[PDB]
Amino acid sequence: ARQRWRSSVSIVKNRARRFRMISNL
Amino acid sequence: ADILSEEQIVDFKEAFGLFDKDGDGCITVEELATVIRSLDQNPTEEELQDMISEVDADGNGTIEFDEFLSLMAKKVKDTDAEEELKEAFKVFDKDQNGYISASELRHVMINLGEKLTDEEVEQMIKEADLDGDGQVNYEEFVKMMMTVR
Ligand SMILES: [Ca+2]
Ligand SMILES: [Ca+2]
Ligand SMILES: [Ca+2]
Ligand SMILES: [Ca+2]
Q: Domain of A11?
């Protein structure tokens, strides 16, 4: 289940509802 | 596999619509500033204008869907652990109780377009949960993201 776990985190990164990129800058 | 489905553009499309309160089609520095300002932070307009013009080829002063998509879709690394480690946990632990509940992880899961089963749900969280307490603590999460083994 480590795959799905990472997928959830990886997918979240792509979704970035907070805009990690823009938010950071 | 390289599937890539509407679920990808949809997620971005949804977020984009959020940035553009006046669904004009293109996000403007002003609108962007308002959203950013209401994000618990207020960066200098200097980098904001430069950053926007940096990606926006025709640097028209607004980010188009195509630009927004590639902008994020392209940039996806880290450069900040405390950011990804905290941002993720913050999302998983919505209630921010220090533990990830199946229900919380259940949504964060299917909410991504995935139909799991009772068996999968168990191993899904039960696997990460080292204490088998049907919950995952931030500590366990960090270790799971580190060694993983
Ligand atoms: Ca607009
Ligand atoms: Ca542009
Ligand atoms: Ca919780
Ligand atoms: Ca645990």
A: 1-25
For B42, the 3-state DSSP assignment is coil
Domains annotated on chain B, with CATH: 1-77 (no CATH), 78-149 (1.10.238.10)
Name the 3-class secondary structure at B64.
strand
Name chain B contacts of A14, Cβ cutoff 8 Å.
8, 11, 72-73, 76
How many domains is chain A partitioned into structurally? 1
The three-state secondary structure class of B24 is coil
Q: How many residues does chain B have?
A: 149
Distance of CA B137 to the CA centre of its chain: 20
Determine phi and psi for B137, rounding to 5 degrees.
-85, 155
Residue among A10, A12, A25 nearest B55 (CA): A25
Distance separating alpha carbons of residues B50 and A5, to the nearest angstrom: 36
User: Are the Cβ atoms of B84 and A20 closer than 8 angstroms?
Assistant: yes
